[PDB]
Design a protein around this ligand. Structure first.
Ligand SMILES: Nc1nc2c(ncn2[C@@H]2O[C@H](COP(=O)(O)OP(=O)(O)O)[C@@H](O)[C@H]2O)c(=O)[nH]1
Lengths: 608, 221
């Protein structure tokens, strides 16, 4: 049994965290980094389950907020200390922290702790019990009014509550605290703990070769092919940190004693000559490199070239607060990775909450926080011109943002359903001259895909959904790929006119007077993957590669040129006599030409 | 306006925060350079990653003076307000701060005016960056003429020759093939006296640069 779990100590600046921790472990200065430790709890009950919490005393100061979402995991309990002294407003001051615990670890308990009980305002339990309980918050399970700097019955009850609430974790009835693991894993953990002492203090990092020498020097029967799984599991438990990603040159170095790494990385936010380049690489991996924090926080005046509501496309993104390192990762992700063309470097005017790439007066893109009146929420207004190049940019930006949300902040998309993230689309029936753009939820417009127009109560007015949300209707791509449903003669599913090889749902039909193969994407899946496919195939255009004739929204399908003789697999299995020597060479030459073209565009076809 | 202290006090009222003359009020508010309020513009340069590095693809000109005059940047921003177009139309992107404008049409038709401070120099500078292409040359001509006109019209004492002249217009050239850096700075009057030829040449005369791609306002380019 693996008796080890992460305890995370969240809170605001100045509020007692390291002092509460010093009085919780009975271990009788501003935090820099996250200050990892670990204390063993010898439970004296009949179930003497000796558990070891490893604490993560998160620093409250704002400049470090960019690196915290990297160290917030699911299998962990949270504390949240909030300085009772400035009552009735320090509770409403820690809602950003709780919202972030909700976004990152949506199903982890939270034990509210109120310090500074000596001075004063204990009626802050009112707002805690009314506004902070269930309204978009990460499932609070206890709340204590504790003192620090001295142990008492308050801290005793708080410590026992942390212990109890830890053991009864049960993510989907799993009992994290008592699960089973291969014995080699705990053996590997013990040898790392011993290696913590025998390593230079100025540089605690260890080498993959040194690890291999260590696992061989003792009787640990872990094979070479088993080490990735083992080392990644110890990473999840917060023993050692490592980054197996090959994009970095760090996979030969396995960070033991992680508190040193974290402190060293946060050193530059307040201000080994061999690993300078690796230092900078992981500095970018922590989102420290151009330092995305300390960017003057002040929007610079921008007089855009295009006014008029009928010449720009707006999209908002509403959420109660911006997540901790949201804007940093976004700026880094949008760093020239969204070009209008498929080259030219654009002008860029960064601040703390925006990018504003700008090619031309008709090929710009401005992302950036925009605050509205009578709305305490936060918004992410995106402005873009209505032309073709504009449509391309809007598609890329929305996909990048959506990907980031699904990858880092899943709790902001979990449906209960307000969903905590409502994507708006600003349209103006008002002929473009007038103003006050009517805002329409995106999912409602998605359900309005049955037609190709939007119409108000007075149906004499209309606006095409392309000039409102060109990411839904397939207009963001280059080269208009509309289906022109009149020409199609597709048959839905007769168990007939089928592609014959059941590779997907691809049928057979006639379009534009010629036979074609239609893959029916329509399913429970959304239109993300359809857009991903469509982009890759819309600009390759090589004779060896299959070419796309058209695509269509109603129903979701894409029309490809038909291969008369079918897959090569069937041909070789049943028609081996048909292959002459010249024909074999021609097939090989065409496939080689395709690989050459793909590798020219820096694409790996992988399975062939 | 009789009793001028009332006009001045009323006009300075809004810098700390008659329904007929509202439009005239705003007109003379612009005449006092109060209107977009050119003061209180956050004073902080926003990061700008220009499209073109490489010393052989941009044209720099400095303007050195011991301090910026009082209302210098306000009148300049107001004067440069879309009155310097590349073409003879299109409105350009603009990113103002307290000491710059940065009009930007295209990645090859931009113009960035703005204070730039140098090391080991207590003086103040007015570095102007512009692409080396044709459209760039047009913009540089208009901006230099606009700046020079403003100086001669409002601050004559900054041009009176005694003669350091308190205002030394530099031109940054780079004999270093564009790859290398540390642009050698040459006083403009000296280059004006170098109009006898159509090239500039260093101690090693195998290298040369045409004066067009350094100061295209002198040679008619
Ligand atoms: N008197 C008193 N002081 C407290 C209490 N809790 C915290 N403090 C003060 O809070 C300070 C500790 O701040 P700290 O948690 O280290 O800041 P952080 O590292 O940013 O989280 C100490 O100087 C304590 O005096 C309390 O219950 N009573």
């Amino acid at each position: 049994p693996y008796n080890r779990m992460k305890l995370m100590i969240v809170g605001n600046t100045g509020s007692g965290k390291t002092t509460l921790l010093q009085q919780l472990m009975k271990t009788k200065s501003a935090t820099v980094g996250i200050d990892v430790k670990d204390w063993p709890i010898q439970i004296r009950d009949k179930r003497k389950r000796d558990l070891v919490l490893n604490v993560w005393d998160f620093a409250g100061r704002e400049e470090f907020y960019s690196t915290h979402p990297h160290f917030m995991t699911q299998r962990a309990l949270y504390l949240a200390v909030y300085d009772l002294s400035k009552g009735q407003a320090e509770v409403d001051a820690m809602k950003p922290w709780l919202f972030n615990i909700k976004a990152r670890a949506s199903s982890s308990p939270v034990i509210l702790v109120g310090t500074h009980l000596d001075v004063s305002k204990a009626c802050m339990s009112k707002i805690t019990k009314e506004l902070l309980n269930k309204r978009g918050f990460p499932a609070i399970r206890d709340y204590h009014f504790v003192n620090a700097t001295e142990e008492s019955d308050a801290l005793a009850k708080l410590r026992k509550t942390i212990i109890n609430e830890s053991l009864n974790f049960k993510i989907r009835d799993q009992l994290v605290v008592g699960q089973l693991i291969p014995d080699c894993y705990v053996e590997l953990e013990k040898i790392i703990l011993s290696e913590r002492k025998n390593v230079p203090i100025e540089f605690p990092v260890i080498d993959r070769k040194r690890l291999l020498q260590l696992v061989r020097e003792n009787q640990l029967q872990l094979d070479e092919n088993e080490l990735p799984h083992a080392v990644h599991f110890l990473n999840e438990s917060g023993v050692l940190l490592h980054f197996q990603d090959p994009a970095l040159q760090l996979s030969d170095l396995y960070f033991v004693e992680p508190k040193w790494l974290c402190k060293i990385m946060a050193q530059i936010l307040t201000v080994p000559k061999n690993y300078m380049t690796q230092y900078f690489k992981l500095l970018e991996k922590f989102q420290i490199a151009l330092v995305p924090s300390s960017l003057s926080d002040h929007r610079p005046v921008i007089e855009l070239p295009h006014c008029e509501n009928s010449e720009i496309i707006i999209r908002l993104y509403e959420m109660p607060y911006f997540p901790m390192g949201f804007w940093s990762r976004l700026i880094n992700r949008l760093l020239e990775i969204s070009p209008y063309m498929l080259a030219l470097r654009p002008n860029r005017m960064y601040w703390r909450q925006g990018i504003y790439l700008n090619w031309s007066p008709e090929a710009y893109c401005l992302v950036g926080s925009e605050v509205l009146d009578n709305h305490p929420e936060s918004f992410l207004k995106i402005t873009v011109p209505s032309c073709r190049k504009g449509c391309i940019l809007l598609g890329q930006v929305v996909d990048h943002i959506d990907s980031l949300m699904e990858e880092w902040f899943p709790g902001l998309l979990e449906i209960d359903g307000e969903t905590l993230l409502k994507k708006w689309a600003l349209y103006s029936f008002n002929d473009g001259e007038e103003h006050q753009k009517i805002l329409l939820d995106d999912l409602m417009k998605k359900a309005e895909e049955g037609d190709l127009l939007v119409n108000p109560d007075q149906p004499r007015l209309t606006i095409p959904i392309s000039q409102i949300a060109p990411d839904l209707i397939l207009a963001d791509l280059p080269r208009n790929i509309m289906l022109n449903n009149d020409e199609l003669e597709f048959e839905q599913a007769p168990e007939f006119l089928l592609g014959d090889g059941s590779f997907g749902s691809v049928y057979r039909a006639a379009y534009e007077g010629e036979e074609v193969a239609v893959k029916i994407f329509n399913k429970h899946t959304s239109l993300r993957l359809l857009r991903q496919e469509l982009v890759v195939l819309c600009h390759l255009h090589h004779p060896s590669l299959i070419s796309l004739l058209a695509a269509g929204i109603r129903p979701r399908m894409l029309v490809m040129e038909l291969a008369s003789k079918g897959s090569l697999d069937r041909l070789l299995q049943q028609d081996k006599a048909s292959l002459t020597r010249t024909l074999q060479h021609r097939i090989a030459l065409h496939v080689a030409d395709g690989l050459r073209y793909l590798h020219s565009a820096m694409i790996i076809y992988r399975d062939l």
